Design a protein around this ligand. Structure first.
Ligand SMILES: CCNC(=O)C#Cc1ccc2c(c1)NC(=O)/C2=C(\Nc1ccc(CN(C)C)cc1)c1ccccc1
Ligand SMILES: [Ca+2]
Ligand SMILES: [Ca+2]
Ligand SMILES: [Ca+2]
Length: 292
């Protein structure tokens, strides 16, 4: 479902997008550098709009990059309040561009790094969008839900950015959020692994013993991937998070993908019903958290 706010914004996005024409390299002025995704906050000179320009260095033939572009045209169709807006994609001087909606809060990975750890009420709302994002995508499949893959903003929006719509792009160019069975329900797992990472403020594999957990409130890359498979999943610490929340992530982080909760089930899980109901000023927290 969409509100008459979420609908109005999508009309305001499209109309401001219909004004923007065919994207060319020369029509962009660099404002600043956002970070490695390398993404620039740009200004589309003729339209006067502000965008996020991802630039991928790729040594490939014409017939290759022309495919990549054709596959990214599919992102014009895919419009949702839980998916980051798309303006276009092209190739120029030895690099493919992807011109997209500028989310002035940056990634949850960034917000975590400055927040410390994210509050439950807040992670309530993050969970709701990430589900509706995945539920929109379903109603093509997704590629890996990280906190670096979730963008947020001062309006109070929470959107999935960078799912995989182009195969050859993935080809031509971490694995620590993958579900064991990948070594559809993998998406839910990652949301479970992520929410925990943000709730406690640290990557939860391996788990912190009572030494850190008491105070709060390294493994080599391939050594980890084993532990993920052969040992039990991470869980929120008890006593500091509500049990409704503890159950949610538990039902997400089940190793056996069948016994793991699906999208339809999570969407009506007590945690969601509680949060959706809650009246939380997300845009306050964020803006005050990261100083805007
Ligand atoms: C082809 C399919 N689509 C994609 O591949 C894509 C994408 C994409 C990727 C990143 C961004 C985006 C879109 N829009 C944005 O605003 C992004 C970022 N904004 C952003 C960062 C920091 C501050 C402020 N900081 C510095 C405090 C503000 C804003 C961002 C950039 C680098 C790393 C993390 C996030
Ligand atoms: Ca250029
Ligand atoms: Ca140029
Ligand atoms: Ca020129």
């Amino acid at each position: 479902e969409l509100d008459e706010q979420q609908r109005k914004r999508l009309e305001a996005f499209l109309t401001q997008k219909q004004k923007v024409g065919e994207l060319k390299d020369d029509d962009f002025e660099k404002i600043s550098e956002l970070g490695a995704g390398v993404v620039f906050k740009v200004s589309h000179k003729p339209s006067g709009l502000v965008m996020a320009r991802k630039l991928i260095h790729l040594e490939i033939k014409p017939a290759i990059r022309n495919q990549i572009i054709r596959e990214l045209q599919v992102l014009h169709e895919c419009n949702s309040p839980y998916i980051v807006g798309f303006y276009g994609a092209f190739y120029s001087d030895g690099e493919i561009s992807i011109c997209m909606e500028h989310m002035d809060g940056g990634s949850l990975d960034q917000v975590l790094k400055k927040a410390g750890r994210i509050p439950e009420q807040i992670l309530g709302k993050v969970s709701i969008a990430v589900i509706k994002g995945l539920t929109y995508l379903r109603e093509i499949m997704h590629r890996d839900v990280k906190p670096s893959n979730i963008l947020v903003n001062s309006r109070g929006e929470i959107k999935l950015c960078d799912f995989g719509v182009s195969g050859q792009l993935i080809d031509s160019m971490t694995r620590s959020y993958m579900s064991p069975e990948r070594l559809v329900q993998s998406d839910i797992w990652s949301m479970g692994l992520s929410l925990v990472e943000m709730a406690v403020g640290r990557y939860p594999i391996p788990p912190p013993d009572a030494k850190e957990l008491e105070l709060m409130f390294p493994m080599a890359i391939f050594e980890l991937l084993d532990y993920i498979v052969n040992e039990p999943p991470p869980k929120l610490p008890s006593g500091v998070f509500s049990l409704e929340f503890q159950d949610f992530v538990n039902k997400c982080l089940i190793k056996n993908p069948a016994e793991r909760a699906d999208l339809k089930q999570l969407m009506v899980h007590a945690f969601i019903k509680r949060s959706d109901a809650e009246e939380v000023d997300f845009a306050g927290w964020l803006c005050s958290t990261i100083g805007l």
